[PDB]
Amino acid sequence: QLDIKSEELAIVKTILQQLVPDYTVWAFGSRVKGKAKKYSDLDLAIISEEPLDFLARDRLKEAFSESDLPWRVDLLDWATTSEDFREIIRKVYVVIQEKE
Ligand SMILES: [Zn+2]
Ligand SMILES: [Zn+2]
Ligand SMILES: [Zn+2]
Ligand SMILES: [Zn+2]
Ligand SMILES: [Zn+2]
Known part of the structure; x- marks a missing residue:
């Protein structure tokens, strides 16, 4: 799960x-x-x-850097992510939010 x-x-x-x-x-x-x-x-x-x-x-990076989280949020763009890497992400992940 999500630590x-x-x-x-x-x-x-x-x-x-x-x-x-x-x-x-x-x-x-x-x-x-x-x-x-x-x-x-x-x-x-x-x-x-x-x-x-x-x-x-930008606004996302801004919001995360302004927040109280004690570590960094590393954003990955699925649209420009390669297939090999997509396959590794699909092995293990936790859904945080779905498109409404
Ligand atoms: Zn990272
Ligand atoms: Zn990491
Ligand atoms: Zn990154
Ligand atoms: Zn990493
Ligand atoms: Zn594939």
């Missing part, structure tokens, strides 16, 4: 719903794999077709 704090999940959950609610978002990486260290980032795949609009991207 983050309750309070941290809701912070993430709020930011995603206000800035990219038309996007499905998956957590992957060491935090879904039980191997999380204190300052491990949180890897999030932003799922869509076409590369995330720059502006909404």
Whole structure:
């Protein structure tokens, strides 16, 4: 499952719903794999077709850097992610948000 704090999940959950609610978002990486260290980032795949609009991207990075989370949120763009890498993410992930 997702090794983050309750309070941290809701912070993430709020930011995603206000800035990219038309996007499905998956957590992957060491935090879904039980191997999380204190300052491990949180890897999030932003799922869509076409590369995330720059502006909404910026605003996401802004919102996460402004928040109280004690580690970094590492955004991955599914649309420009290669198939080999997509296949590895699909082995193990946690859904955070689906497109409404
Ligand atoms: Zn990571
Ligand atoms: Zn990584
Ligand atoms: Zn990372
Ligand atoms: Zn990255
Ligand atoms: Zn494939």
